[PDB]
Amino acid sequence: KEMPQPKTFGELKNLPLLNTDKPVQALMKIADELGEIFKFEAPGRVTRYLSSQRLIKEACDESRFDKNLSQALKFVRDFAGDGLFTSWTHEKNWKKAHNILLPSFSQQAMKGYHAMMVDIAVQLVQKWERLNADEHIEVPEDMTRLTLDTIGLCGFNYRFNSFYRDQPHPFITSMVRALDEAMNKLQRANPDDPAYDENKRQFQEDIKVMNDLVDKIIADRKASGEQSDDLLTHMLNGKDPETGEPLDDENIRYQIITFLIAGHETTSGLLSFALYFLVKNPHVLQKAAEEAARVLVDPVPSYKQVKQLKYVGMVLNEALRLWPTAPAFSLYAKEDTVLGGEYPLEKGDELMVLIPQLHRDKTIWGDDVEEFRPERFENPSAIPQHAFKPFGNGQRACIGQQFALHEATLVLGMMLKHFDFEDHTNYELDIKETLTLKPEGFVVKAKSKKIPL
Ligand code: HEM
Ligand SMILES: CC(C)Cc1ccc([C@H](C)C(=O)N[C@@H](Cc2ccccc2)C(=O)O)cc1
391 is catalytic: yes
Active site residue 147: no
Put the strands of the sheet holding 137-138 in their side by side order: 137-138, 443-448, 419-422
Distance CA 322, CA 418 (A): 26
Backbone angles phi, psi at 345, to 5 degrees: -130, 135
In sequence order, the β-bridge partners of residue 438 are: 432
1-453: CATH topology is Cytochrome p450 (1.10.630)
Q: Whose CA is nearest to atom 23 of ligand 1?
A: 266
Q: Which residues contact 419 (CB under 8 A, 6 or more apart)?
A: 128, 446, 447, 448, 449
The closest-lying atom of ligand 2 relative to the alpha carbon of residue 265 is 1
The reported resolution of this PDB entry, expressed in Å, is: 2.1
Give the DSSP H/E element, type plus range, for residue 295: helix 282-295
Q: Where are the alpha helices (DSSP H) in 37-156?
A: 53-59, 71-80, 92-101, 110-129, 139-156
Number of other residues whose CB lies within 10 A of the CB of residue 449 = 12
How far is Cα 185 from Cα 72, in angstroms, rounded to an integer?
8
154 is catalytic: no
* Cβ neighbours of 285 (radius 10 Å): 18
Residue 258 Cα to ligand 1 middle (Å): 9
Bridge partners of 445, per DSSP, are 422
Whether residue 269 contacts residue 296, with contact meaning beta carbons closer than 8 Å, is answered with no
CA distance 325 to 334: 28
DSSP letters spanning 143-184 = HHHHHHHHHHHHHHS----GGG-SSPPHHHHHHHHHHHHHHH
Ligand nearest the Cα of residue 117 is 1
d(CA 411, CA 211): 30
Distance of CA 159 to the CA centre of its chain: 21
Where are the domains positioned within the chain? Answer: 1-453
For ligand 2, say whether the CB of 19 is within 6 Å of any of its atoms.
no
Angstrom distances, CA of residue 358 to CA of 36, 52, 59, 355: 9, 5, 12, 5
**Which helix (H) or strand (E) element contains residue 345?**
strand 343-345
Query: Cα separation of 366 and 177, whole Å?
Result: 41
Distance CA 199, CA 221 (A): 34
Nearest in space to 422 (alpha carbons), one of 446, 395, 401, 449 = 446
Strands 37-42 and 45-50: antiparallel
